Design a protein around this ligand. Structure first.
Ligand SMILES: [Mg+2]
Ligand SMILES: [Zn+2]
Ligand SMILES: [Zn+2]
Ligand SMILES: [Zn+2]
Lengths: 551, 177, 97, 171, 112, 84, 107, 270
DNA sequence: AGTACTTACGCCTGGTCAT
DNA sequence: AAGTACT
RNA sequence: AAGACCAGGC
């Protein structure tokens, strides 16, 4: 896949290490300074400004360039960009934790709030489960709001031992929108916890403190739950849409960045200009906002960040949410090729394991056969035959990884085949296919049938193999998928073939029988009362194809 | 590439790659404690020229042999005698090997796998480290200064006097031409 | 046509390993990306010509792999990253079991 | 300085060659993609020793095409210079900027100003050389160099070395 | 004893319809729901919290939320999950893939 | 970790998934111009040749059987009985 | 083993885990009027020697965690007084094969 | 859900049922290691029937003019009547079918005797019948030893798990137990000779088949049993098109959710 | 005891309107 | 709407 | 070409 050979060894993914991005790495990796918010028009002149999308990231206009990386569009994944924020911001999805952590550690000196000294604590440090330590720890010290300096050791409650210092009272905390607030207790003291602060307190937390709390010194240090540098997904994640030329077509995402950007610069230009001290934190919320909505948009703090036209805004998160999206609707299930669908009808003249494919499709669907002395002959004929007659083919591909389109190519009728080449040919009588009918909730909702190219337009399946698929002919449709590797078919014929499914394990009994006519009729035909004379008995005999020819 | 007998668990932060010097700190792939395929430990493999000349030859030869077990179904004098062995069992595009055989065979200091044997039986009583027990074998040396200076890794691991006897017995074994 | 969840679950039932992969890759997504044997990421700047490879930042040129995975997957990942989450791709197991 | 390191390599064999003498092919291909290779981590792969007992192990079959993949464990003679290593070789080229000495499969170069002082450079010479009070260095002359620094590149390794120390110079 | 009950009950839900299901299946399920410790619900609130890697639970009811707290606590995924592989485009350890196939060069000679 | 050919414990018979895959895999290669270790009684379809190679048990393959803990057992098409 | 009637004082109970090795357990009368183990459903369990256990593992190549678990408060677990780590063997009847051997470790 | 909750589950080569972690779920798929596919409803004759009938059918006493095998069945009949060393095997056999009985009546209290079990013995014999045109007239040719010593030697080769130790070779006997009862039930001297006049030929064949036919009914390390079981339930849960209690689909929902407040709570006390 | 949180069948074919 | 679990 | 709705098919 992709094409073009690479001297790079090739492996399978075996482990997936989930980490968090360190603003330091984010930079390293990036190839884009991303300072400007505009898209292109270097003063209307078409191209792209070394500002947003392409200060070296991926590209468009069908033009090699991608940091010389050439290859162009197809085969050049996105190249991340970064964009130095102005002031630290929260990570919409982490907020929940960033909070719980502070309630777990007190500021000023930044360190745990319960050491080996407290016993209930011990039992909470043996637990080998991030989800469980961090959930037990939290519950155990979310209540304590005083940075103890001296506690009664394993001996006398009389004798007091010393550890860390700074009893600066611990403030309870609550979540207001995208900011954290806490009081310090006669009468309270309410102040806003500046990101700039939290960040700090985390930076200082101890190495064995990280870990003690559900974390990991190398892949995910708390101090990273707070964004400082922002990775910039490259075109392919937020591609455009061109209506030829002199028009637009930008992608939703490529706007929120546009916003985040604007909202970033406006800020900065205040900390270096007429900075009315606390008329800034009115624009630092805006950043915190965008850089939050960019990732999530279905919050409880209402404002949807409706984009002109009142259209919602597809937050990154929204792209993966269950069903119709990436994970479930793009990865666990996809649209596929070498597949077809039409109406189904009975046809008591097909073997159970067969399936009537209409000529229309047999000529459309193709199978890649590899030229071999065993076939060459046959194959060259299919190729000679063209892509219009039935038994034929429609594509020859040589080692040189080049497609010969059999319907054009001044060489159509020509062509000598070469052992090694492939000849995408038409599906033929007896090509094992995977047939099926949705909803699929059985091994049997998908079985393998022998193909039988037939006229007229409908998949014609044998009757008995109905109840498994659970289908009627009142206008029902079914899907057919076509194998591709000599080994793929093998997997269908050797484990999916209808004959094998006859006995169902779901209820340790056969799962296909005899219905309607055949059944009804098989009874009449039985009766003592029922007698058959020669003239017919002879024909009937002839019908059973394996009749030993013994009247 | 060509993997090397040991899977150093690289935990993201690949940074520390020290210096390569005659402080005997050679790249990780050359600690004196490396691993053999059988799964054992094994002192590094220090080859002094003219000792390598014999090992390359040894195989390049035993190659020619088993390269025919299947075909059934004096200075300037060695320059020719080797070019052939190559044009027989080499890649013919191993311009490196060629150039390694000249170098290896011109600057060599021993012709007898016997003489080369004693060289080794001698130096291997030092307890010195391999790299040293190599530079010592392929480098002329009259004084200890000409030695412990062109091999600073020695300086304190041996008395001048001693390392000096060894050098005496070197120019004594140093095969003629 | 569509080969969704349900139709998958049956292929798993049948135990038709390869045919599954095929429907999922070779007949749909399929994509060849590069990685760093160090930081399990797509970073790598492969110039498949002059073979140059790099991956500054973790800075490489030597340890680099090539892997086949559904383009959607790649995307899933890149998308993830943009949200500041790092999906590491390693070609060897070190955790045993 | 020359080493005999234990390596291994992975060759992907197409089914075509799944013959009777496969072991033969592999080995053969091992040798094509190794003898003469170069890495900063292995240096110069010069020759494969003990051609015979080369361990092939069982190779597994990939899973889309039939290509199989074997982890060929071999053992070879390598050599990778270092900063501070002392070696001697044969000069090859010699210019106004210095001469280049060839230590083995590698080429170490020496900067005019990295040699001594009393040694000037005579251009009007044929062949080109470097004259001294009593010393004369040109094409074939044999020098002994001290490698000050290494630089790995593509399929080779060069390095700069001095002769401004003691016990260094011609021989 | 609870298992016994959980099973007996489920068994009745399929028997009240005149349908028959071979023990083993309800057994299995009933067992899956019970090993862990007590009663693990076949719901987002249960079996999708177990020690199973991320990517797997990711393909169900909590996706992102689950992914987030994965890179947070730097989880590691075995890629032993059916799901896992499907997402990667790899052949999954399942029937046809519960083993490897190799060419025994030795036996590849006595064959000629 | 590996496991001695003795101390072996798996099933002496070939699993359907195994056989299934062998034939496939085998075909695959056969269709790729891999050598064919059996006299073709006129056969010309790879999977069909495969079924033959597999009946004279002349298939040069080895099924490595991984165990839940990582260790494996190595069985040869040769050995493995084929009931089905 | 101590048998309280209507209940024990929460001031009291927090004095059992204060003299190790020795162990203590608490049972309400009302829960011992009937032996739970005699119930049609609850099959019989069995304690395994720290030897018999170190075996069960080695024979199934299992790690402690991969084993089916039982609650430290689970009725039967108290009836035998298990300890976090002790493994029990559950032997029950079966409509597929008379007897089925299963194991449960403790957590 | 059902499905997503059991994907990862399959039968591993050790013949245990685990998921993606390795956590055993069933130490033997279905407490018996048999692939559902090869199973039919057989009857355990040993269970039902008056203590009376049992004797008249399975009891053999070579020390009694009226409880011995009439030499009209066994070739070595007359020269057996009385043989004491035999009556011990004979008695051993009986003291077993007896144990079997009580055992079964301890598992299937109902008295239901028809159960799903691998290898359909009824038919396997039926073929043996007309495959050797066995005549109900002339006598057999089985040493009593021939029978009872082979039936035993049969059970031995019905291997499900293979282990080279105790803990395993012990689960073996277990996973088989139920079957055997049925086996010992259908290959009881009396029966084997008075009901289905099998020759030594017939028999040695019936035995071979059973062994092989069994080794076929085992489960294949590979089956993704998890998904399967899932579907197998969810499937008939759609065909559900609908004495006064919560029953059916809304119920099954309740169950899988592990809900606390079930519309109907009931409770039967005897 | 009150509030908040995530979910909701599978697939497939039409025609319509607009920032 | 409902049902659960978390605050 | 993408997204929202509506009607509809099994
Ligand atoms: Mg219908
Ligand atoms: Zn690029
Ligand atoms: Zn503090
Ligand atoms: Zn990198």
């Amino acid at each position: 896949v992709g094409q073009q050979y690479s001297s790079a060894p090739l492996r399978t993914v075996k482990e997936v290490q989930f980490g968090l991005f360190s603003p330091e790495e984010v930079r390293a990796i990036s190839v884009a300074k991303i300072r400007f918010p505009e898209t292109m028009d270097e003063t209307q002149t078409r191209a792209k400004i070394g500002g947003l999308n392409d200060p070296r990231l991926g590209s468009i206009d069908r033009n090699l360039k991608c940091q010389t990386c050439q290859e162009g569009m197809n085969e050049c994944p996105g190249h991340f960009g970064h964009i130095d924020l102005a002031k630290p911001v929260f990570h919409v999805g982490f907020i929940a934790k960033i909070k719980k952590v502070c309630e777990c550690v007190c500021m000023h000196c930044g360190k745990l709030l319960l050491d080996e000294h407290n016993e209930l604590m011990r039992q909470a440090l043996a637990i080998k489960d991030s989800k469980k330590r961090f959930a037990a720890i939290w519950t155990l010290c979310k209540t304590k709001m005083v940075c103890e300096t001296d506690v009664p050791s394993e001996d006398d409650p009389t004798q007091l031992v010393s550890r860390g210092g700074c009893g600066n009272t611990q403030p309870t905390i609550r979540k207001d929108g995208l900011k954290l607030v806490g009081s310090w207790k006669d009468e309270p003291e309410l102040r806003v916890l500046s990101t700039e602060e939290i960040l700090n307190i985390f930076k200082h937390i101890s190495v064995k403190d990280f870990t003690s709390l559900g974390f990991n010194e190398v892949f995910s240090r708390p101090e990273w739950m707070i964004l400082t540098c922002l990775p910039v997904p490259p075109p392919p994640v937020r591609p455009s849409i061109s209506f030829n030329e002199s028009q637009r077509g930008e992608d939703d995402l490529t706007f929120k960045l546009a916003d985040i950007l604007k909202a970033n610069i406006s800020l900065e230009t205040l900390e270096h200009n007429g900075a009315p001290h606390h008329a800034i934190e009115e624009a630092e919320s805006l950043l915190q906002f965008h850089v939050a909505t960019y990732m999530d948009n279905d919050i409880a703090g209402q404002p949807q960040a409706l984009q002109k036209s009142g259209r919602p805004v597809k937050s990154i998160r929204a792209r993966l949410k269950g069903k119709e999206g990436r994970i479930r609707g793009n990865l666990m299930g996809k649209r596929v090729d070498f597949s077809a669908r039409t109406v189904i009808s009975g046809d008591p003249n097909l073997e159970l394991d067969q399936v009537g494919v209409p000529k229309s499709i047999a000529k459309t669907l193709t199978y890649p056969e590899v030229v071999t002395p065993y076939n060459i002959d046959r194959l060259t004929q299919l190729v000679r035959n063209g892509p219009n007659e039935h038994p034929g083919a429609k594509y020859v591909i040589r080692d040189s990884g080049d497609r010969i389109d059999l319907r054009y190519s001044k060489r159509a009728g020509d062509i000598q085949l070469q052992y090694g080449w492939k000849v995408e040919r038409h599906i033929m009588d007896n090509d094992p296919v995977l047939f099926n009918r949705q909803p699929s909730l059985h091994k049997m909702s998908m079985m393998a049938h022998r193909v039988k190219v037939i006229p007229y337009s409908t998949f014609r399946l044998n009757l008995s193999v109905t109840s498994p698929y659970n289908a009627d002919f009142d206008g029902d449709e079914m899907n057919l998928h076509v194998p591709q590797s000599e080994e793929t078919r093998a997997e269908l014929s050797q484990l999916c073939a209808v004959p094998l499914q006859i006995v169902s394990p779901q209820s340790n009994k056969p799962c296909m029988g005899i219905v309607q006519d055949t059944l009804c009729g098989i009874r009449k035909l039985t009766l003592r009362d029922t007698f058959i004379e020669l003239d017919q008995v002879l024909n009937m005999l002839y019908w059973v194809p394996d009749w030993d020819g013994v009247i | 590439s060509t993997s090397t007998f040991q899977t150093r668990r690289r935990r993201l932060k690949k940074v520390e790659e020290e210096e390569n010097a005659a402080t005997l700190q050679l790249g990780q792939e050359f600690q004196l404690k490396q691993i053999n395929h059988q799964g054992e430990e094994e002192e590094l493999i220090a080859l002094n020229l003219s000792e390598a000349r014999l090992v390359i030859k040894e195989a390049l030869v035993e190659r020619r042999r088993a390269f025919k077990r299947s075909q059934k179904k004096t200075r300037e004098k060695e320059l020719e005698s080797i070019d052939v062995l190559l044009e027989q069992t080499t890649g013919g595009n191993n311009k490196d090997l060629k150039n390694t055989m000249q170098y290896l065979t011109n600057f060599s200091r021993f012709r007898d796998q016997e003489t080369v044997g004693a060289v080794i039986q001698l130096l291997k009583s030092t307890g010195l480290h391999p790299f040293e027990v190599a530079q010592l074998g392929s480098l002329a040396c009259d004084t200890a200064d000409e030695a412990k200076t062109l091999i600073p890794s020695l300086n304190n691991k041996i008395s001048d006097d001693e390392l000096e006897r060894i050098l005496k017995e070197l120019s004594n074994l140093e095969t003629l031409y | 046509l569509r080969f969704g969840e349900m139709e998958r679950d049956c292929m798993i039932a049948h135990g038709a390993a390869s045919f599954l992969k095929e429907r999922l890759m070779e007949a749909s997504d399929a994509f060849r990306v590069h990685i760093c044997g160090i930081c399990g990421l797509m970073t790598v700047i492969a110039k498949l010509n002059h073979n140059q490879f790099e991956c500054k930042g973790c800075d490489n040129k030597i340890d680099i792999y090539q892997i086949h995975i559904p383009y959607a997957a790649k995307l899933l990942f890149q998308e993830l990253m943009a949200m500041n989450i790092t999906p590491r791709l390693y070609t060897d197991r070190s955790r045993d079991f | 300085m020359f080493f005999i390191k234990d390596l291994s390599l992975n060759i992907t064999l197409h089914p075509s060659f799944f013959g009777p003498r496969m072991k033969q092919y592999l080995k053969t291909k091992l040798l094509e993609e190794v003898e003469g290779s170069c890495t900063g981590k292995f240096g110069y792969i010069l020759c494969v020793l003990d051609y015979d007992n080369i361990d092939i192990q069982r190779g597994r079959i990939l899973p889309t095409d039939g290509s199989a993949e074997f982890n060929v464990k071999y053992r070879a003679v390598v050599f990778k210079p270092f900063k501070g290593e002392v070696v001697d070789g044969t000069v090859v080229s010699c210019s106004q900027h210095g001469f280049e000495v060839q230590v083995g499969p590698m080429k170490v170069f020496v900067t005019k100003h990295l040699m001594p002082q009393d040694l000037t450079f005579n251009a009007g010479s044929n062949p080109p050389s470097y004259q001294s009070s009593e010393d004369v260095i040109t094409i074939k002359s044999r020098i002994r160099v001290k490698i000050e620094g290494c630089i790995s590149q593509v399929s080779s390794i060069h390095a700069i070395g001095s002769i401004k120390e003691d016990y260094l110079g011609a021989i | 004893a609870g298992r016994a009950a959980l099973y007996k009950e489920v068994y009745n839900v399929i028997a009240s319809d005149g349908s028959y299901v071979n023990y083993r299946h309800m057994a299995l399920l009933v067992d899956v729901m019970t090993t862990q410790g007590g009663l693990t619900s076949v719901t987002r609130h249960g079996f999708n919290r177990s020690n199973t890697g991320a990517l797997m639970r990711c393909s169900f009811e909590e996706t992102v939320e689950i992914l987030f707290e994965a890179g947070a606590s730097a989880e590691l995924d075995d890629c032993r999950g059916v799901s896992e592989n499907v997402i990667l485009g790899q052949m999954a350890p399942i029937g046809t893939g519960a083993f490897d196939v190799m060419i025994d060069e030795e036996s590849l000679v006595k064959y000629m | 970790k590996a496991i001695p050919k003795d101390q072996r414990a798996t099933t002496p018979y070939m699993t359907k998934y195994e056989r299934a895959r062998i034939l496939g895999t085998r075909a695959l290669q056969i269709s790729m111009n891999a050598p064919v270790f059996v006299d073709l009684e006129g056969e010309t379809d790879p999977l069909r040749i495969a079924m033959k190679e597999l009946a004279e048990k002349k298939i040069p393959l080895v099924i490595r059987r991984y165990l839940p803990d990582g260790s494996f057992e190595d069985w040869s098409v040769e050995e493995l009985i084929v009931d089905l | 083993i101590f048998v309280y009637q209507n209940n024990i004082t929460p001031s009291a109970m927090k004095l059992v885990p204060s003299i190790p090795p020795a162990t203590i357990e608490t049972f309400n009368e009302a829960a011992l009027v009937v032996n739970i183990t005699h119930h049609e459903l609850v099959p019989k369990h069995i304690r395994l020697s720290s030897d018999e256990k170190r075996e069960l593992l080695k024979r199934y190549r299992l790690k402690e965690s991969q084993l089916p678990r039982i609650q430290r408060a689970d009725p039967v677990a108290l009836y035998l007084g298990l300890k976090r780590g002790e493994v029990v063997k559950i032997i029950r009847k079966s409509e597929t094969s008379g007897r089925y051997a299963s194991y449960r470790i403790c957590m | 859900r059902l499905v997503k909750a059991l994907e990862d589950i399959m039968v591993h080569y050790d013949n245990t049922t685990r998921n993606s972690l390795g956590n055993v779920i069933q130490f033997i798929y279905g407490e018996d290691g048999m692939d559902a596919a090869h199973i039919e409803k057989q009857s355990l004759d040993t269970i039902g029937g008056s203590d009376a009938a049992f004797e008249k059918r399975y009891r053999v006493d070579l020390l009694n003019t009226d409880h011995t095998l009439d030499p009209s069945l066994l070739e070595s009949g007359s020269e057996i009547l009385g043989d004491l060393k035999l009556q011990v095997l004979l008695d051993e056999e009986y003291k077993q079918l007896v144990k079997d009985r009580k055992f079964l009546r301890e598992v299937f209290v109902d008295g239901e005797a028809n159960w799903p079990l691998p290898v359909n013995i009824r038919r396997i014999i039926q073929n043996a019948q007309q495959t050797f045109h066995i005549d109900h007239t002339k006598p057999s040719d089985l040493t009593i030893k021939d029978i009872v010593l082979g039936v035993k030697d049969l059970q031995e080769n019905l291997l499900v798990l293979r282990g080279k130790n105790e803990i395993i070779q012990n689960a073996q006997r277990d996973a088989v137990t139920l079957f055997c009862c049925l086996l010992r039930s259908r290959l009881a001297t009396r029966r084997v000779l008075q009901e289905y006049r099998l020759t030594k030929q017939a028999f040695d064949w019936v035995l071979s088949n059973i062994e092989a036919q069994f080794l076929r009914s085992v489960v294949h390390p590979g089956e993704m049993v998890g998904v399967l079981a899932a579907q197998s339930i969810g499937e008939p849960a759609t065909q559900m098109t609908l004495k006064k209690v919560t029953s059916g689909v809304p119920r099954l929902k309740e169950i899988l959710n592990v809900a606390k407040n079930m519309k109907t709570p009931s409770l039967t006390v005897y």
